[PDB]
Amino acid sequence: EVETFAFQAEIAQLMSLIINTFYSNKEIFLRELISNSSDALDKIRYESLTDPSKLDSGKELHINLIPNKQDRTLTIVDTGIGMTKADLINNLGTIAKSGTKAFMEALQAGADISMIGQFGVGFYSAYLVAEKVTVITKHNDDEQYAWESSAGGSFTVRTDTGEPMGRGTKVILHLKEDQTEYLEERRIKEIVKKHSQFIGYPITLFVEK
Ligand SMILES: Cc1ccc(-c2ccn(CC(=O)O)n2)cc1
User: 3-205, which class in CATH?
Assistant: First the structure.
C-alpha cells in the first residue's frame, strides 16, 4: 500500500533549482547529510539524558557510509531520533517552505548552493548527485517507513517491510550515472576529512568486496 503525495510548490521549485542549476561543487551533499545525521543523533541523545529508555531501541550513536558499486548507491545510516510518518510527509522534519524562501533570496543576493544547510533544507542537496532518493526511518513513537522521490513533483510513503532498523534514518542515494566518484573510498574519505572533521559521532566508511 503506497501513498503518493505532491510536494508543496516551493519545495518542487527548490528541487528543480538543485537539479537544473549549473554548479560544480556537488560534493557538499555529503556534508549536509552528515550534518543532518549529527542533528538527529543530538536529539535522541538529549532525550536519553532524562529518559534512558529512549535508547532501548539502540544505545550506539553513530553514522555509517555504505557505498555499493553494483547497485550504484551510497547509503548514509544514522542511529538518531528518526522520523515519524507525519515528519516524513512534512518535508522530512524540516520547515522547508520558509527555508526555501530564504535560500532563494540569498541566491539572488549573492549566495551559492553550497550554503543550503544554513536554510534548514540541506537534505535536498542529495539531488545534486542522486536521480532517486529513498529514506528509511524508524522513530521510537512510530513504525518503520520508506519515503522515496525521483523529483518530478511527487514523493511516496509506504510502511517498510525491509530489514528492521531499531531506530534512526537511512538515506539511500541512487546516484546519477556521471556521479559514481562518490562511491570511491578515496573520494569519500577526502570529503569527510574536508567538511565533516568536527562531527561528534563516529563516521565509519564501509569498504566493498
Ligand atoms: C544545491 C543548490 C543549487 C543551486 C541553487 C540555486 C539558487 C538559485 N539558483 C538558480 C540561479 O542561478 O539563480 N540555483 C540552490 C541550491
Answer: alpha beta
